[PDB]
Design a binder for these strands. Structure first.
Ligand SMILES: [Mg+2]
Ligand SMILES: [Zn+2]
Ligand SMILES: [Zn+2]
Ligand SMILES: [Zn+2]
Ligand SMILES: [Zn+2]
Ligand SMILES: [Zn+2]
Ligand SMILES: [Zn+2]
Lengths: 103, 103
DNA sequence: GCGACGCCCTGTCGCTGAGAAGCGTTTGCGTCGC
DNA sequence: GCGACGCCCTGTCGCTGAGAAGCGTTTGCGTCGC
């Protein structure tokens, strides 16, 4: 029951995907089917999340919303999506979410 | 895709289950459907395996065949099945299988 | 001390259930003679 | 050094793919006045 992690090439990031990056946590649209869960805030919403490009990454641990990457790590989702070598904070061992920081 | 770990009470261990404990690795009967995998030797066979009674155990990591528990840990499967508090070597942190010992 | 109301940077954790498995290439050792 | 054949305690590792996710109870702070 692990969601397959697919690495999206930087050249295939579209303008609509960039525009649908969340700019405020309260503006999110929840969808139990088409939404994607942010690893940090654990909300399943339809705004664009990051895509970890580490081949050894798995599941949703690499998916971060606009506000969460902005506020918890000082990184922009738009920059991460256009970064060919971007690795998620869990991959880098620097994730400060409520679960990863006690561990 | 994790096999549910069910704790079998000692009072419900039957005579047939005891008799079907493997006494020699070469006598095992392989069955891809009704067999059970031994965590140590990773063979899926129909001989009786151990049942870890630690509630926090999960999956097949607690299932050990007769010869493997006998040879790798000096414990008898019959004694382990009749032990109300028996915990698998992975739970005890003493598993010496090819995977757990490099880790 | 517990939570209101402004401020600026517009924000977060709890809980359950989660945490592989098994086919394939798989079976000890020591002392010999290839 | 690589693998045969006896011995006794009758035996084991490699590899792929595996390694949660998301609903619920969820949103910063400081300084006030309850
Ligand atoms: Mg799973
Ligand atoms: Zn988030
Ligand atoms: Zn990652
Ligand atoms: Zn984390
Ligand atoms: Zn075994
Ligand atoms: Zn166990
Ligand atoms: Zn092990």
């Amino acid at each position: 029951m692990t969601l397959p992690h697919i690495i999206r090439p930087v050249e295939e990031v579209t303008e609509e995907e960039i525009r649908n990056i969340c700019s405020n946590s309260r503006e999110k649209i929840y969808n139990r089917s088409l939404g994607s869960t942010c690893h940090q805030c654990r909300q399943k919403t339809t705004d664009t999340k990051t895509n970890c490009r580490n081949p050894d990454c798995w599941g949703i641990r690499g998916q971060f919303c606009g506000p969460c990457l902005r506020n918890r790590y000082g990184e922009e989702v738009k920059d991460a999506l256009l970064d060919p070598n971007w690795h998620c904070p869990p991959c880098r061992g620097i994730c400060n979410c409520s679960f990863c920081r006690q561990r």
